[PDB]
Structure 1
Amino acid sequence: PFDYILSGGTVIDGTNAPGRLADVGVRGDRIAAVGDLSASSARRRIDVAGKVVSPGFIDSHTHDDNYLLKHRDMTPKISQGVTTVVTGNCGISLAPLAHANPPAPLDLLDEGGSFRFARFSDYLEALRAAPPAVNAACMVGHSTLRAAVMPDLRREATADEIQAMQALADDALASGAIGISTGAFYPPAAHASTEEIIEVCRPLITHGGVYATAMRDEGEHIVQALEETFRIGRELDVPVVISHHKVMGKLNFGRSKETLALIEAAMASQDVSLDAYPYVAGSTMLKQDRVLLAGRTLITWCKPYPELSGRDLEEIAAERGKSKYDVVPELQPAGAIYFMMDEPDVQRILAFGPTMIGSDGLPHDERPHPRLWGTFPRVLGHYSRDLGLFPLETAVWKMTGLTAAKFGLAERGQVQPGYYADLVVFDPATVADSATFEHPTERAAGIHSVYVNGAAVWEDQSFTGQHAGRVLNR
């Protein structure tokens, strides 16, 4: 007999096909059957009439590396219907690195002495021993590797350092990492040459992992950054994932037509993917950058001056008698939200066929960007239902079937017999992001229940206590 059957609802199976009325039966950690299951014995027959049963959402871009360890409930994500998270993005991974004061933006994962894993396997072992509520597909970050190997990061790596980083990268992949990510836009890796990146990532071809990247530049020189990324992809002959695609700065508004055309062209000749979050503001370390600081900027957290959390940087700068750009150094290390994107571009990028959904949430932030709590329902409700940017089955596909395929997460991302029972039950009519910039931690509406490996992790708007997540391998 099945452990339970979610009956009477509409199944959107994650294959980008219109929903159909069907029941979903689960046995253990697997979807046992799909369709009219009235004739199948089940210990429980849960009524989900009026609801949609879809695969659990896979967050293609997270910085939950440490959050998975410190807050196993993973409420910010499971409350949105997320059942799997891809960690170690933008070249930022928790391991391998034993450092009491890791350089920004690595500190976005730190809660105080959090970087205690000398080896990547130690990190994965820790997750398996005390599993989080969601599954985890982990990547190792190039910037973390540089921090672990290089005495001085403000220069290109030497042959010996590249060899040391490549060794760590290979060990990580051998231990279960699903890929390597880079973030050359940031200080720790701004001096890394394209050749350094290629050599450090050589193990990807042997282990069959992916190359993910926060491109070196997403503004005036985004074309050159895109070309570098495509080049690395060809040199490695592995799939590449362009993280949080956008065109930033008023002088680049509307250029998404241009970038998407370049990406579409590259996809015809090589393996290219991309993801994005549904907002016009970004968030990361507070950095001295003319473009990032051109528009409205909010502080998410500040080490030297904790009271600044939540404040407008323009006000802070003005009151200190300096420009936003000049006041940044004295406020570091800190985090911020940057309003430097335009809605039309965000919509164009989200609607672009291949674009996967990634929250890019920064879970440790005192006053976080709302994407941390409302990304997925915002795509399902606001964009799909309310604006009609795409049909619901396509919106679901963009956060389930597509993502599972691109990251190689076998037997997940689809409501199919035999696949793992990562599922979400939501009300298509009411699903919506409740988090706003003003109140960034409000729980989304319309999320009835969430299941991971068959176990309900979210029910009655609360974590059930089921630490059902597993460390996944590609």
Structure 2
Amino acid sequence: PFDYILSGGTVIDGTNAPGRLADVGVRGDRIAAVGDLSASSARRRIDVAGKVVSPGFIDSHTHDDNYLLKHRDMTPKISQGVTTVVTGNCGISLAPLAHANPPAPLDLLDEGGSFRFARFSDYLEALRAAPPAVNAACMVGHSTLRAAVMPDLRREATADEIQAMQALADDALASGAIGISTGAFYPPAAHASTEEIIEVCRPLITHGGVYATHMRDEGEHIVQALEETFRIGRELDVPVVISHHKVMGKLNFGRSKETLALIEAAMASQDVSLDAYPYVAGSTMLKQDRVLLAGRTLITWCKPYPELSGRDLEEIAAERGKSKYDVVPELQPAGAIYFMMDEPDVQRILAFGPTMIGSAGLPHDERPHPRLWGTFPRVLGHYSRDLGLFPLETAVWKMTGLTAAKFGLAERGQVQPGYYADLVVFDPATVADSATFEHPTERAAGIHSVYVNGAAVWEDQSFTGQHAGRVLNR
């Protein structure tokens, strides 16, 4: 007898196929059967008529490393239908590094002395001992490795440092990390050479992990950063994941046509994947960058002047008698939201076949970018249903089946008998992102319930208390 059967709904199984009327039976942490299950005994038959039952959403791009430990309910994600998170992106992982004041953007994961895990394995052990509501697929970050090894970061690593970083990278993979990420765009790794990155990431082929990257540049020199990424993939011979793809700055609007053709061509000869969030504004550390600071900029938090949270940077700069660019140093460390992308490029990137969905949410931010709470429903409702950017089954595939395949999360991402029961029940007609820039923490509409490994984690718009998540390995 099944524990429960979700009956009367439409299943969108994650294989990019139109939905079909069918029930879904669960037994323990597995999907037992799918189809007309009226003849199967079950302890509960949950009416989900009018709803869609799909695989739980896998957030391909998170910075939930620390949040998973500090807020095990993971409300920002489970209230959106997310059942699994990929952590340690853009070269930023919580472990391995014991440091009381890590260099930005590492501070985006910190709540005060959070960087206390000396070994990557200590971090994973802490997650297993006190599981979060979602599953976690963790990567180790190259910038974190740099901060842990190099006394001085504004230079290339020596052979000995490279040996030290590679050793850490290898232990992490050995412990269960699913890959290694980089973020040469940022200060901690701006002086890292392509060869340093390659040497440090060689353990990837031995352990079979992926190389994920916040490319060195995403504007004027994006072709060069793309070629560097492709080159790295060829030298390591592992799959590469291009993080939050975009063309930023007015001088680059419209160039998504050019970038997607380069990526498409590369996919024909080597293993390449990419993800993106559905918004025209980005968000990270406050940084002296001519392009990031060209348009509207909002402060998400600020250490020296906390009362600046939520304020427009132009106003702050003007009142301090400077350009946004010049006022940045005296406000650091801080976080910001940057409106530097164009809707047409974002739509093109999202619609591009292989693009997976990733939030890039920054959960510790005082006044966060709404992507943290609205990413997935925004794709399902606004883009798929309201704008018809793709049919619902394809939008679902982009956050379930596709993603599970690229990160190698076996037996998840599909509503198939024998697979784990990570599931979402949503209303296709009302599902929507409620979070806005003005109110970035509003709970999404149309998400009925969410199950992780067969246990309901979200019901009646509330965390159930089930710490059902598991640390996953690729």
Superposition TM-score tier, normalisation by shorter sequence: over 0.9
Measured after TM superposition, the shift of residue 348 of structure 1 is: 0.1
* Equivalent position of 2:3 in the other structure: 3
State the shift of 1:58 in Å: 0.1
For residue 374 of structure 1, give the secondary structure of its aligned residue in structure 2: helix
3-state DSSP class of the match of 2:429?
Answer: coil
1:410 positional shift: 0.2
Q: 1:316 offset after TM fit, Å?
A: 0.5
Shift of residue 178, structure 1, vs aligned partner: 0.0
Cα distance, 1:350 vs structure 2: 0.1
TM-fit CA distance, 1:147: 0.2
* Distance in 2, Cα, partners of 1:101 & 1:421: 40
SS at match of 1:372: helix
**How far off is 1:317 after superposition?**
0.4
Cα distance in 2 for residues equivalent to 1:300 and 1:416:
41
Describe how 1:216-227 pairs up with structure 2 within 5 A: 216-227=216-227
Cα displacement string for residues 287-309 of structure 1 (whole angstroms, at most 9, x for unaligned residues): 00000000000000000110000
| 1:161 alignment counterpart | 161
| TM-superposed deviation, 1:321 | 0.6
Distance 1:319 1:184 in 2: 33
Q: Distance in 1 between matches of 2:303 and 2:141?
A: 24
Task: String of CA shifts for 1:27-53, please: whole Å, max 9, x gaps.
Answer: 000000000000111000000000000
Tell me the residue number matched to 1:132.
Answer: 132
SS of match in other structure, 1:40: coil
1:332-385 residue CA offsets vs partner (Å, 9 max, x unmatched): 000000000000000000000000000000000000000000000000000000
**Residues in 1 aligned to 2:90 and 2:307: alpha-carbon distance in whole angstroms:** 28
**Cα deviation 1:117-172 (Å, max 9, x = unaligned):** 00000000000000000000000000000000000000000000000000000000
1:9-33 Cα offsets, whole Å, 9 max, x none, are: 0000000000000000000000000
After TM superposition, give the deviation of residue 185 of structure 1 in Å.
0.1
Match of 1:30 in 2: 30
Quick one: distance in 1 between partners of 2:79 and 2:374?
A: 9
Deviations 1:203-257 (A, max 9, x none): 0000000000000000000000000000000000000000000000000000000
Q: Which runs of 5+ in 1 are unaligned?
A: none
Deviation string 1:82-140 (CA, Å, 9 cap, x unpaired) is 00000000000000000000000000000000000000000000000000000000000
Write the deviation string for residues 374-425 of structure 1: whole angstroms up to 9, x where unpaired. Answer: 0000000000000000000000000000000000000000000000000000
Deviation at 1:68, TM superposition (A): 0.1
Q: Aligned equivalents of 2:17 and 2:182: distance in 1? A: 34
**Inter-partner Cα distance in structure 2 for 1:41 and 1:171:** 47
Aligned-partner Cα distance in 1 for 2:226–2:73: 37
Structure 1 CA distance for aligned equivalents of residues 305 and 161 of structure 2:
36
Mapped to 1, the partners of 2:140 and 2:418 lie a distance apart of 30
Q: Hey, what's the Cα distance between the residues in 1 that align with 2:141 and 2:305? A: 29
Within 2, Cα distance between the matches of 1:333 and 1:162?
28
> Which whole-Å CA distance do the structure 2 matches of 1:249 and 1:172 have between them?
36
Number of the residue aligned with 2:55: 55
CA distance in 2, matches of 1:430, 1:214: 34
Secondary structure of the structure 2 residue equivalent to 1:241: strand
Match of 2:463 in 1: 463
The CA distance in 1 between the partners of 2:42 and 2:166, in whole Å, is 51
* Distance in structure 2 (CA, Å) of the matches to 1:25 and 1:284: 42
- Measure how far apart 1:462 and its partner are: 0.1
Tell me, in whole angstroms, the C-alpha distance in 1 between the residues paired with 2:316 and 2:107.
Answer: 22
Deviation of 1:324 (Å): 0.3
State the identity %.
100
Shift of 1:258: 0.1
In 2, Cα distance between the equivalents of 1:235 and 1:320?
Answer: 49
The residue aligned with 1:108 is: 108
Task: Tell me the secondary structure at the aligned position of residue 6 of structure 1.
Answer: strand
Alpha-carbon distance between aligned partners in 1 of 2:259 and 2:202, rounded to the nearest angstrom:
27
Cα distance between partner residues in 1 of 2:301 and 2:92: 18
Gap runs ≥5 in structure 2: none
Count of residue pairs brought into register by the alignment: 474
Give the match for residue 262 of structure 2: 262
Q: What's the TM-score once normalised by structure 1's chain length? A: 1.00
Corresponding residue number in structure 1 for 2:352? 352
Distance in 2, matches of 1:370 and 1:83, equals 19
Partner of 1:149: 149
CA distance, structure 1, for counterparts of residue 303 and residue 223 of structure 2: 35
Q: CA deviation at 1:451?
A: 0.1
Distance 1:398 1:165 in 2: 34
Name the SS for the 1:136 alignment partner.
strand
Structure 1 segments of 4 or more deviating over 4 A?
none
Please report how far the alpha carbon of residue 281 of structure 1 lies from its aligned counterpart in structure 2 after TM superposition: 0.0
Q: How far 1:61 sits from its partner (Å)?
A: 0.1
The match for 1:171 is 171
Displacement of 1:266: 0.1
Q: CA offsets per residue over residues 300-331 of structure 1, 9 Å max, x none? A: 00001100000000001001011000000000
**Distance apart, 1:177 and its partner CA:** 0.1
